[PDB]
Write a protein that binds this ligand. Structure first.
Ligand SMILES: [Ca+2]
Length: 291
């Protein structure tokens, strides 16, 4: 394998940053140097395509599938394979919300009960709290396409999502906020995703699909989204061994939810958790090296 270091992008939610460090140490284990960089979560696909960054370890189908597809179409990035995980990223509510709006999880119920989700800032509209803007791109677009009486506010971090959900528990205040599985949160605050329109092939390209035959983004995200691994086209050539390990690398829901939990509940630094997780789970990743 080449002497050039492998460049691993790090973003702004817990499993991704832990997973990234877990994998880095694995690569180092077999003698490949690695370097980390923090990047915007949507823009990283163009960077991988160009080889400014070597790979991406968490290609969520829902949030990043379009940017991935777009890079792939341009050329220069490679679908290395999928983790054995299935993902869902969407508007979500803690279970007590049903008390206020028992038509849920139907998205039409959500909208019917809109005024219940209003905050001082949205006045008469329901408040949806999205995550950082480099995640789900099209909240506002989805609201307009489905013609919902909601307004969208982007949280400044993942932690603000957990703050809001947690802070609504005491008075069982209805809230709807961005969330995903696998992840630690649902285990803390049981709930459900809003059932938006079923994702179908090319709802982010073809208006004729979805409850709005005249515009895009009227679909909810995939209920069984993939979680892919992407690589720069040059990676297999330069680091065949690291690339081969990368094709074998596969984390599951439980492992991912656990990694998230280590930062968000147990309050560990992502790199500390990664080193701990590795040491505690060498039954997991060893065979990826062939041993
Ligand atoms: Ca449509």
């Amino acid at each position: 394998d080449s002497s050039d270091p492998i460049v691993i992008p790090i973003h702004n939610w817990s499993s991704q940053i832990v997973m990234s460090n877990v994998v880095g140490q694995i690569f180092e284990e077999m003698g490949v140097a690695v370097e980390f960089v923090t990047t915007d979560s949507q823009a990283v696909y163009e960077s991988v395509r160009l080889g400014d960054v070597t790979l991406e370890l968490e290609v969520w189908e829902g949030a990043f599938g379009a940017s991935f597809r777009a890079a792939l179409e341009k050329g220069g990035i490679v679908d290395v394979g999928d983790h054995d995980a299935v993902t869902r990223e969407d508007w979500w509510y803690p279970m007590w919300t049903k008390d206020a709006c028992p038509g849920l999880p139907d998205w039409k119920a959500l909208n019917d009960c809109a005024a219940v989700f209003a905050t001082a800032e949205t006045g008469d509209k329901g408040r949806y709290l999205d995550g950082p803007v480099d995640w789900l791109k099209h909240g506002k677009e989805r609201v307009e396409a489905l013609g919902m009486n909601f307004e969208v506010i982007n949280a400044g971090s993942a932690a603000a999502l957990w703050a809001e959900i947690g802070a609504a528990e005491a008075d069982k205040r209805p809230v709807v906020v961005f969330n995903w599985t696998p992840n630690f949160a649902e285990a803390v605050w049981p709930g459900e995703f809003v059932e938006f329109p079923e994702w179908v092939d090319g709802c982010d390209k073809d208006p004729a699909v979805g409850p709005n035959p005249d515009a895009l983004y009227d679909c909810g995200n995939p209920a069984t989204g993939y979680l892919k691994k992407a690589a720069w086209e040059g990676m297999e050539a330069k680091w065949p061994d690291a690339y081969a390990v990368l094709t074998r690398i596969s984390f599951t829901n439980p492992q991912i939810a656990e990694m998230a939990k280590l930062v968000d509940v147990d309050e560990m630094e992502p790199d500390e958790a990664a080193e701990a997780w590795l040491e505690a789970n060498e039954d997991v990743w060893r065979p990826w090296l062939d041993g």
